[PDB]
Swiss-Prot record:
GO terms for biological process: proteolysis. It catalyses: Hydrolysis of proteins with specificity similar to that of pepsin A, prefers hydrophobic residues at P1 and P1', but does not cleave 14-Ala-|-Leu-15 in the B chain of insulin or Z-Glu-Tyr. Clots milk. Keywords: Aspartyl protease, Disulfide bond, Hydrolase, Protease, Signal, Zymogen. It is an enzyme of class 3 (hydrolase). GO terms for molecular function: aspartic-type endopeptidase activity. The active site is at D35, S199. This is Endothiapepsin. It comes from Cryphonectria parasitica (Chestnut blight fungus).
Amino acid sequence: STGSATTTPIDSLDDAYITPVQIGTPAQTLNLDFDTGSSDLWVFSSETTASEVDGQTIYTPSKSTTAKLLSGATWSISYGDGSSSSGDVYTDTVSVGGLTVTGQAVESAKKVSSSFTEDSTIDGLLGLAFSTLNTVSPTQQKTFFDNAKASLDSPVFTADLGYHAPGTYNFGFIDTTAYTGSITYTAVSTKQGFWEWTSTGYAVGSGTFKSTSIDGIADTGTTLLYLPATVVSAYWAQVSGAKSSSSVGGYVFPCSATLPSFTFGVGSARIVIPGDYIDFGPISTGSSSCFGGIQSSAGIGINIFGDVALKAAFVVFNGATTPTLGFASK
Ligand code: NA
């Protein structure tokens, strides 16, 4: 079997991407943030504290003839951005782009932090990292991909994020029309539960390529590209008036600037992020100071190839016995 779903940026900056997911019988469609950096499928629901819902579509398990309470199961998660959610668990029928999993753990939120309430466009998360990160207790649960894997034509899913435009998540097949040239595959460590891999270096604009290993995670749930402070300083040094602002919380640049591209290596291959992709616009409405798309990973304790880097590529998440990543230009 296969599935194929369109993913749509939630706003004009590509802050995140929502994909419609069918839950239950009859189907309840919710717009979920597919997150290769986490392993919980959780939703706004009929159980979510009323004051903490502000325009989201909710899952109502009592209206689903296939929902069953997973008795005694709870979950609680804390993301890199300080946001959080928690609640109890149902099993139900979950379909993404025509691919159906029966008995999927659907984690129903009783509580969500302010950043979730404040985003009316995201109905929940669908994690696509390794199931060893799933937070359900006392019985850890499998991701949608882990449940689907055995039924898929090939044990893979692909992320084809758009720049200010819709993209695609495909499950169980590589669309050979969606990229140019060849896919370059690179080794993955699952030691941290992430799609963790080692980039072979970087270049800034038309600059020479610096050969250097950069360990990091491929994370569709993180907006920006977080890299070591050396690399990030080398990038913003090429932008007149760019500086790191304590008060704003990272690199800002004059909104009059033309930003240079950023290239990252995948083995002997090169993925070029156009300069436009690194522009996250004014820091506040009306400001001439703009927020950078490339930021320091210092403090975070890991490098993160977030949407700024991934949307420049056709990315293959190979869930074979020995998992690998694939990157192609497109
Ligand atoms: Na922000």
